[PDB]
Amino acid sequence: MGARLITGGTVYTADAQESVHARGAVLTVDDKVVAVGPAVEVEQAVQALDPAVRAELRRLDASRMMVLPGFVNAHWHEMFAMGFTMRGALRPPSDRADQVAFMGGGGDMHQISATFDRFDGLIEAMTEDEARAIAEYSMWIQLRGGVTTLGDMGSLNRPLAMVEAARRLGMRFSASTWASDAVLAPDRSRFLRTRDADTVLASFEALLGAVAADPTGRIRCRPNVSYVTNMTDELARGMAELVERHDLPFATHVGALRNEADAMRAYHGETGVRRLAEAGLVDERLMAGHSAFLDDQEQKLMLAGRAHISHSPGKYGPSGESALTETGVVPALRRAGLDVSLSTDAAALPGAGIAETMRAAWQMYNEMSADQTEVLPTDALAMATRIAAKGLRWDDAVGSLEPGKQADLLLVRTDDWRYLLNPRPLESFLWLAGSADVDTVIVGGRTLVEGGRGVEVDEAALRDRYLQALRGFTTRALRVPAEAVDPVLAEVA
Amino acid sequence: GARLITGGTVYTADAQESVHARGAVLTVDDKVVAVGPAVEVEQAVQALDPAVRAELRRLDASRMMVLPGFVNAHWHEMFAMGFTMRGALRPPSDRADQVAFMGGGGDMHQISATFDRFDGLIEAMTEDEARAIAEYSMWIQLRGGVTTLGDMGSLNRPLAMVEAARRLGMRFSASTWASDAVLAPDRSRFLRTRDADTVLASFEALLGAVAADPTGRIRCRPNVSYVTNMTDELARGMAELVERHDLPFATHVGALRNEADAMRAYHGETGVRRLAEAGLVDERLMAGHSAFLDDQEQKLMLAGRAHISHSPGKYGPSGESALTETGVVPALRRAGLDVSLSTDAAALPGAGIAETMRAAWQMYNEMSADQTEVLPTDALAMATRIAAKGLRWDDAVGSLEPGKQADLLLVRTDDWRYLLNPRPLESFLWLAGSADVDTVIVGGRTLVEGGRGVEVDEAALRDRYLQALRGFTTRALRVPAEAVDPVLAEVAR
Ligand SMILES: [Zn+2]
Ligand SMILES: [Zn+2]
Ligand SMILES: [Zn+2]
Ligand SMILES: [Zn+2]
Ligand SMILES: [Zn+2]
Ligand SMILES: [Zn+2]
Ligand SMILES: [Zn+2]
Ligand SMILES: [Zn+2]
Ligand SMILES: [Zn+2]
Ligand SMILES: [Zn+2]
Ligand SMILES: [Zn+2]
Ligand SMILES: [Zn+2]
Ligand SMILES: [Zn+2]
Ligand SMILES: [Zn+2]
Ligand SMILES: [Zn+2]
Ligand SMILES: [Zn+2]
Ligand SMILES: [Zn+2]
Ligand SMILES: [Zn+2]
Ligand SMILES: [Zn+2]
Ligand SMILES: [Zn+2]
Ligand SMILES: [Zn+2]
Ligand SMILES: [Zn+2]
Structure with a gap:
């Protein structure tokens, strides 16, 4: 699944020192974090990579973003x-x-x-x-x-x-x-x-x-x-x-x-x-x-x-x-x-x-x-x-951005009015943002969500299958009449 | 002129805290004239002067929640x-x-x-x-x-x-x-x-x-x-x-x-x-x-x-x-x-x-x-x-009632946060906030639409604010330019 460098943003690690890096970087190889810290320290890790791995490196410009652990x-x-x-x-x-x-x-x-x-x-x-x-x-x-x-x-x-x-x-x-x-x-x-x-x-x-x-x-x-x-x-x-x-x-x-x-x-x-x-x-x-x-x-x-x-x-x-x-x-x-x-x-x-x-x-x-x-x-x-x-009992592999842990992370956009001038974007996020402001989600180095949309899955398709399942279960198991359910589902569509 | 906002859930904050699913708000000039079930408000539109009923601006709010300002x-x-x-x-x-x-x-x-x-x-x-x-x-x-x-x-x-x-x-x-x-x-x-x-x-x-x-x-x-x-x-x-x-x-x-x-x-x-x-x-x-x-x-x-x-x-x-x-x-x-x-x-x-x-x-x-x-x-x-x-402004504002000022908000309710909830205000309090306000109307005039200024340019207000903040901070608060200029240089757009 190759190497990824996420650079330029504020990086929150949730490591033992609760480390925060302004203009920080995360280098991932396959499923794992290899380096996290100041962009200059992480560039040293990029130069230490096998040439064939460095040649396939995906560079993600996160300069207008905050990086969090999953x-x-x-x-x-x-x-x-x-x-x-x-x-x-x-x-x-x-x-x-x-x-x-x-x-x-x-x-x-x-x-x-x-x-x-x-x-x-x-x-x-x-x-x-x-x-x-x-x-x-x-x-x-x-x-x-x-x-x-x-x-x-x-x-x-x-x-x-x-x-x-x-x-x-x-x-x-x-x-x-x-x-x-x-x-x-x-x-x-x-x-x-x-x-x-x-x-x-x-x-x-x-x-x-x-x-x-x-x-x-x-x-x-x-x-x-x-x-x-x-x-x-x-x-x-x-x-x-x-x-x-x-x-x-x-x-x-x-x-x-x-x-x-x-x-x-x-x-x-x-x-x-x-x-x-x-x-x-x-x-x-x-x-x-x-x-x-x-x-x-x-x-x-x-x-x-x-x-x-x-x-x-x-x-x-x-x-x-x-x-x-x-x-x-x-x-x-x-x-x-x-x-x-x-x-x-x-x-x-x-x-x-x-x-x-x-x-x-x-x-x-x-x-x-x-x-x-x-x-x-x-x-x-x-x-x-x-x-x-x-x-x-999963802190062996997840919960913080540290070398050897799984490449599980979030990107949040920090370029709008809520974040302006704040050196602590996590504070602005807690004041004025929420679940819907998560932009990118990566699990084991794989992008699952980008721009708030599924990469490999379509939210629209999951929603349609969920509504169809809810109709069957609600009318058959919960005994709510189809006449009360079908109109509500019809007005979603 | 006259404006009809129809199809959405309307919260009035009137004395009974009235909520109308498939509600409507009819405004003439600066004032609310009718609010209630869409069918009841259509009867008010038919009771308008024909010249007014002609030139009515209809806003389809069927996938929206309407709130008082x-x-x-x-x-x-x-x-x-x-x-x-x-x-x-x-x-x-x-x-x-x-x-x-x-x-x-x-x-x-x-x-x-x-x-x-x-x-x-x-x-x-x-x-x-x-x-x-x-x-x-x-x-x-x-x-x-x-x-x-x-x-x-x-x-x-x-x-x-x-x-x-x-x-x-x-x-x-x-x-x-x-x-x-x-x-x-x-x-x-x-x-x-x-x-x-x-x-x-x-x-x-x-x-x-x-x-x-x-x-x-x-x-x-x-x-x-x-x-x-x-x-x-x-x-x-x-x-x-x-x-x-x-x-x-x-x-x-x-x-x-x-x-x-x-x-x-x-x-x-x-x-x-x-x-x-x-x-x-x-x-x-x-x-x-x-x-x-x-x-x-x-x-x-x-x-x-x-x-x-x-x-x-x-x-x-x-x-x-x-x-x-x-x-x-x-x-x-x-x-x-x-x-x-x-x-x-x-x-x-x-x-x-x-x-x-x-x-x-x-x-x-x-x-x-x-x-x-x-x-x-x-x-x-x-x-x-x-x-x-x-x-002491409840003579004119604070609720959607006939005779009060046409001050209201539209919030989109078509995303995952609102799905199947007959109480979109509840979904709004769970998972939304200030950034989810779509439309803002004051005295019947649209000031915000799609979260953007109609008459004002947010980017232009921001740049004038940053220029003023730089002057005041360096001159009146005596913060050295060396500490201010780098923060302003980092500002996203
Ligand atoms: Zn460090
Ligand atoms: Zn050094
Ligand atoms: Zn066992
Ligand atoms: Zn443990
Ligand atoms: Zn005992
Ligand atoms: Zn005690
Ligand atoms: Zn056993
Ligand atoms: Zn046994
Ligand atoms: Zn920043
Ligand atoms: Zn105060
Ligand atoms: Zn009991
Ligand atoms: Zn009460
Ligand atoms: Zn006086
Ligand atoms: Zn009063
Ligand atoms: Zn007391
Ligand atoms: Zn006294
Ligand atoms: Zn006096
Ligand atoms: Zn529980
Ligand atoms: Zn003056
Ligand atoms: Zn002066
Ligand atoms: Zn003291
Ligand atoms: Zn003193």
Whole structure:
């Protein structure tokens, strides 16, 4: 795939020193970064290349651009199959009758638990062609917003359809399976077992076997538990044994909601982080989604275990979640030295991407502390790249522009009014830009996106296949009448 | 003449926060005549005089969202400080940044001293520098959909900003800089810096000059820079001026954690109580920030039916804690005080109204665990109708209703961010911003189309601004040409 020199722009590395190079350069050979730094230092690396390699060198003039490492979104859910029903296309245009529901008002724990336990049934209701079309468009939207490495933490989609989508798109993907074996029902004093733990674990073992063979280096997998509410002691024990035996990372959602601790005590006799700790899951392998509603003992367990938190401050308000300011635990654990990364979470229609989440962290963590240095723009970038990659156990290959790492990078245009006179274009990007301002996306030295358009894929073709799949799934599986769906899709066209 | 904008989703920000899918706006000359469902507005077109119904300009807005023009009632022209104020001369790396100025609770001595130096710098800029910088600064607000702009104290010449607004075709509430005290660290009491009567005479001169304006686009509103820099005589003088001429009034108060202690030490009393003693806590008051208020001061604001302008998009990067440290502004909004959203300002482009609406939607909802506390339509009302009420301009602007000025925005809704969403304002708050404003109409006149000036050339405004900034920065701020010329030499086009 040959050599590429990207020169002249401001280069953000997200390396250990959070290095920024004005008039910087990145030299890539095949899939790897070979040199990054001042243009003059990188030109010395170009002159050291084999003559046959230097002769094929592609020079990209990035003088009116900012270069970033590819975003690593380690906490994401494929949910686009629910685009008509889940807070989606059938809502009234007026928001005035909206109610506090689902995750809002501290969490409707019965409704959340019941909803999560229904995923297996809905996944089985979609065809493999519907699953592939929805996955490919959903994952394209992440790639288009600069996500080069995507982490599944439990999707309403078929795992191997999402793996096939990632293979076709050219992006990196950490695949998972849906894992729920208990429900918290309103008529009961105790959790109701819905599945055999061994069956849930066999489903992940099948995925692990299928991606073990992948030759691209772009596909990994990571087991998750959907939510500690929907987790038996047997599933927790089984997950601990699986991640030890196969040397894997582990993910779950825990301390996500004000009402979680009381539901966990009532139905399981113990709170989320303590149940994980008794199974041996609170350790360096753990990425905890949200992880804000933790008492002092649970905070100390996370610190002692050197666990990881994925935080989604771009999307809490619109869900009615209070996982930032009600406890202030995640910023406090970050100050105490816990690894904290930024993720999008997900929804059934496009929501905040990584770029929007970086802005949210920069605004919100700094405002809470009355400190513009708590999250610097380069910290928000590290939290969406290098630190995220560390939580996913992919920081061997991705998350920073350093020699020997994968050539995964973004170009953003910096020639318009938003960037004028600013020596810190990442700051202008966090003020006034977002996902739609990502211009070029390169993964393993291959250009996947240029001018905001697919190079090897057509967004228009992915959209058409996604809409066709959504029509089939929505009318057949969700039982929304074709008479209500077809007119909406006809007005897109 | 008559213009019909039809087919899109129309947000009115009327008293019911009305949203019309497949809506229309009919304008005749400068005014809205009908707004509602496209079919209802076509009946209004048929009820027009036939000569008017003939010569109707039809704008197909079927793939667009229509909004009222944004009303940014709390803004400062600060672009003259682009080289020194968190500006163009900073290192590209942010890693050495320190907590300064407004951060860490507020450096009250430094803030007071800084504000008291504005008059000197305003006198140092030429009328031509003032006009060029004002016109570009105010263009950036217009390009981001601001149709009505409120000056709350600028580092610029008042008549230059009035001339800039007249030239651009936007609405402007002009003010003068007002500071007559400084908090000096070597003294136990405030130091009087100017005669109150002289400060008031400067505003009286502006009021006289804009009294004659025939456009209906120019008003004025006196402000006090900050209650730290305000003598009892200036407050009493302002109260008499706004009563005699029936004007609104604006100031910054309760902005910083360290304000109350500095106000007690140097003035013997906190900000809102000092305003109440002068008779300024009433329906005319727009209080900037207004978060660090005790229970008695909150009750004074409620009793007075005063107004708060909140800038949650920009607190974090300034190290301000005017949202979460006290929670007072969301609490006063819940209690039924008028609260609007504003950008505040900086010396380089920062968060516009679109970014501030997103911030409010995320941040107020997250604090309350309530996705309904600020609905997207509430964020819009806070940036339009409610802002106009605080500025006392809601007679003519802030909502799309019959008899109001034809001030509106068109945003394209045909890309991936909007696909299948019956609530394009929600998609706009998730994933769009100032740069996604397509068309801006003021009094029925198109000023911006496709994000470009219709009557003005953005490239020409930029070059005049850069020429003026070079002169002012080297001559008045005493930055060597050797530091300025290289930055200007790098400017993209
Ligand atoms: Zn270096
Ligand atoms: Zn050297
Ligand atoms: Zn219940
Ligand atoms: Zn087994
Ligand atoms: Zn293995
Ligand atoms: Zn095995
Ligand atoms: Zn136990
Ligand atoms: Zn504590
Ligand atoms: Zn999640
Ligand atoms: Zn590692
Ligand atoms: Zn530059
Ligand atoms: Zn001092
Ligand atoms: Zn002069
Ligand atoms: Zn003049
Ligand atoms: Zn001093
Ligand atoms: Zn008078
Ligand atoms: Zn008068
Ligand atoms: Zn007094
Ligand atoms: Zn109180
Ligand atoms: Zn202000
Ligand atoms: Zn309300
Ligand atoms: Zn009014």
